[PDB]
Homo-oligomer: A and B are copies of this chain.
Amino acid sequence: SRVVFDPSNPTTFSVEAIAAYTPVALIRLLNASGPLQPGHRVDIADARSIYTVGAAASAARARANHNANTIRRTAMFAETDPMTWLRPTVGLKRTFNPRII
């Protein structure tokens, strides 16, 4: 599922399983494509879309795995409940170097 001749097998299956850096390097070092006649070379838009979807999924998985210092999140809009007679904690968003968490 890593043949560069057909740009449909290494789209998401070989990208979302592990880090995409190695498949990207392999694709870069293995030219672009060979014989486009015996394969599903038509409708390259779908292949590009599925490849980008797989890359986005891999990036999101890597970010979730590496986000060990940022797990708690909240909203920014206020006055979302009728019981807003008090002032909650202000704090700050994720705009600082990770030192405490």
A residues with a Cβ closer than 8 A to B are 28, 31-33, 44, 48, 80, 82-83, 85-86
For A86, list chain B residues within 8 Å (CB). 32, 44, 48
* A contacts with B: majority SS: loop
Further 7 A-B residue pairs, CB within 8 A, beyond A33-B82, A33-B83, A44-B86 = A28-B80, A31-B82, A32-B82, A32-B83, A32-B86, A44-B85, A48-B86
Smallest CB–CB gap between A76 and chain B, Å? 19
Smallest CB–CB gap between A1 and chain B, Å? 19
Smallest CB–CB gap between A14 and chain B, Å? 16
A85 CA to B44 CA, complexed, in Å: 9
Among A28, A48, A82, A86, max chain B CB count under 10 A is at A86
